[PDB]
Design a protein around this ligand. Structure first.
Ligand code: OGA
Ligand code: MG
Ligand code: NI
Ligand code: ZN
Length: 331
């Protein structure tokens, strides 16, 4: 068995190997990359996502989200308070202000210490989930706006044509902006490209150990657990590496820098934080190996998780028993 310790693997494809996306994902899996739940892909030196980032300031962040924490430093939830619209140029200036900017630090480990010590005492503003792309249309390789769609994969594997679309999302971050512990919708893959700015630190639980994280979360967030049998789908709970280590939960960590891709694998729980002003692009995708994970994915039916239009068909075809209850949660 390849990668039996479930370490995060880092790949350096050549420009020739960067042509065929599906083939390279299957290669990384042949080497055991999925066992970690997360892999890093450093693009060939010849590749670029676009020519420059000099002209992005007029993108609108219609609904910036202020991430307000409750709890203790290592075990907290966050809720998202909606703020007034602002442009990316306005948000960059805000991220660089004395109130929000990255503090002085020695190295990524010192910054990680400061994040976990101090996160809860601040409320950073995240420009999340903005439909769009920063890949140039002429970028042919690993262009997250030109991937094969999940609907087409389901149709190829299973023979059933379904409605729905699959487009990328932009994320504009600042120091301390936080992504809570989750797997993807329908336990899909995700791919994330850090276009510019400061790093993103990731934490990940191997898929084979995801239920260990779920059991800890039910213990640590006991009210939320009674409210919903899949409350991590709400994407609000944070647990620190120290608390994970105290409780014996297997996990790994890695820092993504600008110019690098990350892939999350089916049922790989992940969480993390931004170091400073940055912009990332991400999308879900599927492969043949996902289908079995989609069939078994948990679902929130309490009404909190509320998701995209395209998840309807995935539930309806892969999980027909659950469909009725899940759709009640959506309406
Ligand atoms: O970058 C972020 O805020 C969160 N991204 C992801 O969870 C992802 O790409 O799967
Ligand atoms: Mg612009
Ligand atoms: Ni994710
Ligand atoms: Zn729920």
């Amino acid at each position: 068995a390849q990668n039996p310790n479930c370490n995060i693997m880092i790949f350096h494809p050549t420009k020739e190997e960067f042509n065929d996306f599906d083939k390279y994902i299957a290669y990384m899996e042949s080497q055991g990359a999925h066992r970690a739940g997360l892999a890093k892909i450093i693009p060939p030196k010849e590749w670029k996502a676009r020519e420059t980032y000099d002209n992005i300031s007029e993108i609108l962040i219609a609904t910036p989200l202020q991430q307000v924490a409750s709890g203790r430093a290592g075990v907290f939830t966050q809720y998202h308070k909606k703020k007034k619209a602002m442009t990316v140029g306005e948000y960059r200036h805000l991220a660089n202000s004395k109130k929000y900017q990255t503090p002085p630090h020695q190295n990524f480990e010192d910054l990680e210490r400061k994040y976990w010590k101090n996160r809860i005492y601040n409320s950073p503003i995240y420009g999340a989930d903005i439909s769009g792309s920063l890949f140039d249309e002429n970028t042919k390789q690993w262009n997250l706006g030109h991937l094969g769609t999940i609907q087409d994969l389901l149709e190829k594997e299973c023979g059933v044509v379904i409605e729905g679309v699959n487009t990328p999302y932009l994320y504009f971050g600042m120091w301390k902006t936080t992504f809570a512990w989750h797997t993807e919708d329908m336990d899909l893959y995700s791919i994330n490209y850090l276009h510019l700015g400061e790093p993103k630190t990731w934490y990940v639980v191997p898929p084979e150990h995801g239920q260990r994280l779920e059991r800890l979360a039910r213990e640590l967030f006991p009210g939320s657990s009674r409210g919903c049998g899949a409350f991590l789908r709400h994407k609000v709970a944070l647990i620190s590496p120290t608390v994970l280590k105290e409780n014996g939960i297997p996990f790994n960590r890695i820092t993504q820098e600008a110019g690098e891709f990350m892939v999350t694998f089916p049922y790989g729980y992940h969480a993390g934080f931004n170091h400073g002003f940055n912009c990332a692009e991400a999308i879900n995708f599927a492969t043949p190996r996902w289908i079995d994970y989609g069939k078994m994915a948990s679902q929130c039916s309490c009404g909190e998780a509320r998701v995209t239009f395209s998840m309807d068909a995935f539930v309806r075809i892969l999980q027909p028993e659950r469909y009725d209850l899940w759709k009640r949660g959506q309406d």
